[PDB]
Write an enzyme that holds these catalytic residues in place. Structure first.
Site, PDB file in Angstrom:
ATOM      1  N   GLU A 151      -6.068  -9.422  -2.314  1.00  0.00           N
ATOM      2  CA  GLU A 151      -6.672  -9.633  -1.016  1.00  0.00           C
ATOM      3  C   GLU A 151      -8.194  -9.616  -1.206  1.00  0.00           C
ATOM      4  O   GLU A 151      -8.721  -8.778  -1.927  1.00  0.00           O
ATOM      5  CB  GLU A 151      -6.265  -8.510  -0.074  1.00  0.00           C
TER       6      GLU A 151
ATOM      7  N   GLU B 184       0.896  -1.127   0.000  1.00  0.00           N
ATOM      8  CA  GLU B 184       0.000   0.000   0.000  1.00  0.00           C
ATOM      9  C   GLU B 184       0.923   1.162   0.000  1.00  0.00           C
ATOM     10  O   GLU B 184       1.035   1.902   0.996  1.00  0.00           O
ATOM     11  CB  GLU B 184      -0.979  -0.033   1.179  1.00  0.00           C
TER      12      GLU B 184
END
Ligand SMILES: [K+]
Ligand SMILES: [K+]
Lengths: 983, 983
Positions: A509, A445
């Site tokens: 994810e 991220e």
């Protein structure tokens, strides 16, 4: 000012990152990968002198000199974060930096971390060089340390390192002496590197992985590149290429590739960057997750007199990995990625033993997972050796996540390129020859920009034979796979029907497994299993990141954010716990759902009369002729009517029909179930031949009017209705009371973690006051054997939540029918968690028996798993210890349920269709209120819930909430339960 | 009411106690004693489900049924006391029962222990029987559990046990099933057995030693008795006898005795209690502590077809142990018992790993200990195998101590005989074939009476070849050795000069090693080394029983009584810490004294001119021709003048003279030292050839007038005396101040543990207020370069402790002479701890150098060890971390001492004779006040003490206080120190 305040200070004097080239004693050692028992290897793990301060000025600066005395210091275990050995503070935060907080007198300001609040752990131990290592080159290897350290040997500076998840190495040969040697690392909790280590995990310190010495000749194997591919025409002939970097300084370098039968199949010899000859194995044994076929590669340096001076080696798997015609393929076959994200975690912190790693892969395989994504950092070297050995696809990932930081992104500041590319090279080099590694990932991220363009560019330039992905890349060029994470079913459908795309949709994810979760999993798989170009993804995640503690009364519990430190310690609560297993690898209910949906043999009942089944083979490289079907028909009484074993041949991805035969159901049986189970003919060392690797059950309606379970009249029933609430306030059997509390209508369930985020969840429930209901009688009519009450359903504020009619009818049977009509006021009731009755029985009624989906917890949007049958259990066994206590214990598709004491006293309860129920040791008030497991107390009673309706659980903690078919309807509804007292 | 409330309920269904008869796979396994890797052995150690309650009524009673669900329980590590895994409360008490206290609503009342306050730890785990064990007999073995337990397998009751320190075993063969088995122990913190387990140690609970299964044929070796003696005429021919008990049900039993070269030397065969033929080995290899020569005995059962059905075995040592002509003899030689008591202790509690046990015996041997007494209970089986292997005499002891209880003695209540004899048989059976075990002991602080008469009688009836002792027996018949413990030098002398005695005086416990201790050790050994009938004894004890913790700032510390639990928790403070080592086996100073006095090669200088030494060989079975003398003469400047190696032959117990040669000392040197050191020609695996096994130093006066250490004038000295106190309040060198506080007279030292009990100790000091002194000027006379002050020495109450004259004289040198005359008022000052000056320097002056006895802490009654020489060190290194902080850091026989910063600034200090000094990081107030190590704080200064006199340390915590030659004289005294500023 000092090195760890700079984003450029990533290393000094380290060796170039490379593949592991441990010197072994013996080709036979090389095949086992058993390098730790080599005479040329020496662990430095064990007890070390340790010292800790807050504030680098107050540290013992000279502890690294052999003359500095550390005898009055404590020991600390190495490896292992020091937070888990009594030092400093374990902190869990999420999209933030724990140091960007008022407690630390610091606002985030890259590349700077706090100074006076920063922590120093000084480590030192002594050691003797083995006698046999005389004249050899010696390398120091620290497999991983967080966050930044200086290291010395014998008081000589070696250098320093940032980057906590791959090895740093120094050649320490000229720094060694006779007798006692010393080694020192001075370790900082924070450096500039921490800005790229902002993963969703515990923020921890110290030496996390092994520290060791290995020893080679002055001339050694420095590195080597293995290529073992397949021709892209038929994918049947192996392609073998090998480059060996020889360091230092007549001699030859020679390799031998050997098969499982120690037979030599390829081999070369040359008399530094040696490039061997391209070679070809026809009809080679190919590698994949289902048949992880391996070869052993031995590399030997030899004396001018042909003697072996060094032997090293690795396992080799011939296999290809690519994006073909827009789909991710292994060995020419596009595969479904059924995987999970794995973080490294144990009670020691980031440090994971061999047994725990083997536990991990053993459970994964047992639950039909075929790929693992390394949650934002490369893993302990041994993890890759497990994946090659037993067959998992690995998606490996550079240790780069700066979540804490758009335009200020560290992805776009070129002064952080050196950190990024350093982290990436290191990930590549150490794992490039593992067949288990199929995809490289750039980070997590951390935003998109020039840094990931250079990272992507560089990686593509050295790697031709593995895709490279990056989730924050989105649709820009620098990603080979569309990774977009936690997207809804619809968003996946918007993508795959576009015609200008060239990249498979693979969820990096998805299906956030936090608390009672993984709802809607069927729906994701209807999409993957039908879209040639949404090939699945990785569940978030594998293991709860929790610590087990014990309170002052011996009550154990799980910990999470806020649980260590002072009161306002940084904290993101239980959000670090998102696993398919608890922290000690005990599975959560939702994991059984994953085994069911991830199974590779799926079946449908195609013809009820002949019992003809269609069987689809979802394996990629296995024929169904490796398995054995067991089938059986069973009546609601639990009497097997027909059973058999069967052996089908069916190719991967192909379908096949199979007729089981008609079977005569008696007229006394009310329904029958056809169970199909599959097992393997041959064991692996991880799955024996009795382990049910795929199953399926189908419901067969029969003609019986009654459940073979229905009891017979058992004496004289009485009952009482409350003048004020309209609740069933008593039910006796020959005088003996059965209720410990009144039966009332419930609309609420103690929030799951999802419930607390769900758009339609506990935010709405608690705000309508549904957790605090009362009934008031509007009118009550009574006869000798029945009662009709019209009630108002009020929250504690007195607001009318809805209208209800409660109808109690004593049957000539002694059974009591309870028929309930309810309608919520949809002007201000926007959601309910359930529709049903609730009541308490004294806790002696702990013998629960039921005919329903079991043996485990299921919800309407998480109940493909399990089998309808007759099951025995107890309220204590039904309660699952989710990290924060929440709703648990639900059974779905229930025909009937019994609660009895050991004496046999109790009641048998049925409805007019399948219902849901639970029966738990703790009340709802208490369960909602508890924040940690040890808060739970028993009150002498069990709480029973009988639900006509209850919501699914969805996955709202991150991503989609409960899907619409699974919400609880707000129309007027009528449901009925019949209670039969028993003796 | 329940079993654990009875002193008779000592077992049920257990096997008869016996010798360990583990089935091995391989004769080669038998020689290594490597039984844990046998295919017929299976550990149950590992993680177990665990549950804890206070109050046996509130326990999960049914946890032992396979159907009882324990999935929501925590795990606990087995083996290991549960107090050290977060449960319940660790309590240390001494001559009391921890349960005989108001906190537990109980007064002691044997055989009853508390009921509602009693603790239950329920343990359960599952397991699979190995496939290969089909049809075999299986035994469950629990090596030790405290205090009482029930055990079940598969829900079948096996029985129960009292007696925490030897194995209990059940044959569980018919209780096993297919698939998953379960095992359950329900463990009580207290039972009636606890009354016999009142040892001076931590009061702890749970499973303390290994739990395991082993498997044998239906016909097995049940037991066997080994006899390997020597003829009592010449002690040269071995006598070998063997009895084998065969249990269960054509077949033969056969043995082979083999020597170190695997060659068969004896062997038999028979076709159940088989008695083999008496046999004789002439010129056999004999066993003792110095040459632990072993044989390997293999025992095999064979098929009717001659095939091996079972193999078991043990090491054999040919040796005799007896009381001959009133003296304890090994192999016909009366030996000196140089030993220590050992308790079992680690951070896990009573549970001791193999590495820790090996650490124990390694350090013991390294410090010239030749015997170990098992502190009041038999030890982990592996301890005996270490003693046979490396050579220690073991005094083994039954687990019987009822200290908490004369006429009410449990020794005299015949209803406790079954407990006593059970504990004794079990101790005997399990260890009877170990050669390392030389003496059996009956128990400890349990009183005398009929129970020990029956115990003694029984033991004597089965044991003909080992003495049997009992310390509480005193002179009654039931003891073969006079064990009387902690007796004074005089009391030993009263005994050995009596003519009506027939038993050697051997101190069971002596020289209590608590805190800064083991004073007067020389004096004990002058007696043992000259009395043919006081043959030494066992130091109390080996290892501090402490736990290391870490406080909220990362400061580690040792714990002791009172440290866990609520405020008034039972507690006997730090009295559990009495070791020659700290809890993690780091040696205390006093241990170096023990190595010195226990050494086996003692020497005296007999002729100063030729350097002729008399050498006495205190070994019992080694010639000095096994060693190498290194000698050397060295001058106070640290310049070797003569050195050599030497090789002497000398028989055990014989003496030998050796002339080293005259050596010319220069005229510039002021004194010389002759150092003698001895090493072994051949290593053992425990002691290399560089380890100094015995040493001796002798002082050689020379003609020099000055210490080659004396500095030269270094600039301009000034100084200042205080108008009010008469103290030296300043000393500069070119303006730079050297003192951080005034120089004053000190009479006190922060109490050692001994000081606090000593008749002449800190009780007197603190009560005269010596720890709070002030000087008041009576008259002060001053000239330009000197000062004379007559002061009163007052305590804080203002009482005059004594009179003093302080004389300050600046020398033409720049050095300042300080001559002090003091006389305490002996009308009410009965003791002083020391006589000297004290002052603080800023902590930058940390470079301490000195010519004195070193490198370690010594006191006037504990300073045979060490060597006078030039030593470098720091105040941080000098401070020893005794469990409670006390005086530490003393150096004795000091010629001069220097304190300097790194810049070289400081002072060089000399006296007119050898003095004592210390220099520590913490002040005296703070050090006296601290009760735990982490209480210590630094204040920026070091405290220097210069002592003309300081007391010995003695051993008063238990036994003799400081002996009279070591007390501090109370006459008028004058001592002088000269401070030379340096640059
Ligand atoms: K809750
Ligand atoms: K103290």
């Amino acid at each position: 000012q000092p090195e760890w305040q700079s984003q450029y200070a990533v290393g000094l004097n380290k060796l170039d990152p490379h593949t592991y080239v441990w010197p072994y004693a013996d080709a036979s050692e090389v095949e086992k990968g058993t390098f730790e028992q080599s005479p040329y290897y020496m662990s430095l793990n064990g007890q070390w002198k340790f010292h800790w301060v807050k504030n680098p000025d107050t540290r013992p600066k000279d502890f690294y000199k052999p003359s500095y005395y550390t005898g009055g210091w404590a020991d600390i275990k190495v490896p292992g974060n020091w937070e888990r050995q009594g030092y400093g503070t374990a902190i869990y935060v999420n999209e933030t930096y724990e140091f960007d907080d008022k407690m630390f007198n610091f606002k985030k300001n890259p590349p700077l971390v706090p100074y006076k609040e920063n922590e120093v752990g000084s480590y030192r131990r002594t050691f003797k060089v083995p006698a046999g290592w005389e004249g050899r080159r010696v390398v120091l290897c620290c497999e991983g340390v967080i966050s930044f350290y200086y290291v010395w040997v014998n008081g000589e500076f070696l250098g320093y390192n940032q980057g906590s998840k791959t090895a740093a190495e120094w050649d320490i040969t000229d720094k060694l002496t006779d007798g006692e040697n010393t080694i020192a690392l001075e370790v900082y909790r924070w450096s500039s590197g921490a800005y790229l280590e902002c993963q969703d995990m515990w923020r921890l310190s110290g030496i996390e992985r092994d520290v060791y010495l290995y020893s080679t000749p002055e001339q050694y194997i420095a590195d080597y590149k293995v290529t073992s591919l397949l021709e892209k025409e038929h994918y049947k002939e192996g392609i073998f290429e090998l480059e060996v970097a020889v360091g230092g300084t007549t001699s030859s370098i020679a390799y031998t590739l050997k098969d499982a039968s120690d037979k030599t199949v390829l081999e070369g010899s040359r008399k530094n960057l040696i490039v061997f000859d391209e070679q070809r194995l026809p009809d080679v044994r190919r590698w994949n997750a289902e048949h992880p076929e391996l070869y052993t590669l031995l590399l030997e340096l030899k004396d001018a007199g042909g003697k072996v001076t060094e032997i090293t080696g690795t396992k080799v798997g011939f296999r290809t990995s690519e994006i073909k015609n827009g789909r991710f393929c292994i060995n020419g076959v596009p595969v479904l990625v059924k995987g999970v994200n794995r973080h490294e975690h144990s009670q020691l912190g980031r440090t994971v033993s061999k047994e725990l790693m083997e536990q991990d892969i053993r459970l994964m395989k047992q639950h039909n997972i075929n790929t693992v994504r390394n949650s934002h950092y490369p893993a302990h070297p041994y993890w890759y050796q497990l994946c090659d050995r037993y067959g998992l696809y690995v998606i490996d990932e550079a240790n780069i996540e700066s979540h804490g930081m758009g335009p200020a992104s560290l992805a776009k500041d070129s002064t952080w390129l050196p950190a990024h590319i350093d982290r990436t090279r290191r990930m590549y080099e150490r794992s490039k020859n593992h067949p288990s590694v199929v995809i490289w990932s750039l980070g997590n991220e951390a935003g998109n920009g020039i840094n990931f363009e250079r990272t992507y560019d560089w990686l593509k330039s050295v790697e031709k034979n593995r895709p490279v992905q990056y989730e924050r890349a989105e649709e820009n060029y620098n990603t080979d796979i569309y990774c977009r994470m936690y997207r809804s079913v619809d968003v996946i459908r918007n993508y795959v029907v576009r015609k200008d795309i060239y990249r498979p949709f693979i969820l990096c994810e998805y299906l956030h497994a936090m608390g009672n979760s993984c709802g809607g999993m069927k729906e994701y798989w209807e999409v993957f299993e039908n879209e040639p170009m949404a090939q699945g993804g990785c569940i978030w995640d594998w293991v709860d990141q929790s610590f087990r503690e014990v309170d002052k009364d011996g009550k154990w519990y799980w910990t999470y954010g806020g649980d260590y430190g002072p009161k306002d310690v940084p904290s993101f609560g239980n959000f670090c716990c998102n696993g398919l297993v608890n922290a000690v690898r005990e599975p959560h209910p939702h994991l059984l759902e994953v085994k069911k949906i991830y199974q590779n043999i799926k079946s449908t009942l195609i013809d009820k009369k002949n019992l003809t089944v269609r069987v689809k083979n979802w394996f990629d490289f296995s024929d169904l002729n490796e398995y054995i079907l067991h089938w059986k028909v069973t009546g609601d009484d639990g009497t097997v009517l027909a059973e058999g074993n069967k052996e089908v041949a069916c190719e991967p991805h192909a379908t096949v029909e199979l007729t089981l035969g008609a079977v005569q159901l008696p007229k006394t049986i009310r329904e029958a179930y056809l169970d199909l189970g599959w097992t393997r003919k041959k064991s692996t060392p991880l799955v024996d031949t009795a382990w049910e690797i795929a199953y399926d059950q189908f419901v067969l309606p029969a003609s019986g009017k009654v459940w073979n379970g229905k009891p017979s009249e058992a004496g004289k029933t009485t009952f009482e209705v409350d003048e004020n609430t309209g609740a069933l306030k008593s039910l006796c059997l020959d005088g003996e009371e059965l209720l410990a509390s009144p039966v009332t209508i419930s609309l609420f369930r103690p929030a799951t973690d999802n419930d607390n985020r769900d758009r339609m969840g506990a935010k709405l429930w608690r705000k309508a006051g549904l957790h605090t209901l009362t009934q008031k009688v509007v009118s009550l009519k009574e006869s000798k054997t029945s009662a009709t009450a019209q009630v108002n359903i009020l929250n504690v504020t007195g607001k009318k939540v809805g209208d209800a009619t409660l109808e109690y009818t004593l049957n000539h049977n002694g059974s009591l029918k309870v028929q309930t009509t309810f309608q919520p006021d949809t002007t201000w009731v926007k959601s309910i968690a359930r529709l049903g009755l609730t009541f308490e029985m004294n806790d002696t009624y702990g013998n629960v028996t039921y005919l329903g989906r079991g043996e485990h917890e299921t919800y309407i949007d998480r109940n493909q798993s399990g089998k309808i049958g007759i099951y025995t259990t107890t309220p204590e066994k039904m309660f699952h210890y989710y990290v924060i206590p929440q709703s648990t214990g639900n059974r779905t598709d229930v025909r009937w349920v019994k609660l009895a004491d050991d004496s046999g006293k109790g009641c048998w309860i049925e409805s007019d269709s399948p219902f849901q129920f639970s029966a738990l040791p703790f009340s709802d008030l208490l369960l909602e209120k508890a924040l940690h497991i040890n808060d739970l107390e028993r009150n002498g009673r069990i709480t029973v819930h009988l639900d006509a309706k209850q919501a699914g659980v969805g996955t709202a903690t991150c991503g989609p909430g409960v899907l619409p078919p699974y919400l609880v309807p707000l129309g007027k509804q009528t449901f009925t339960f019949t209670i039969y007292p028993v003796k």
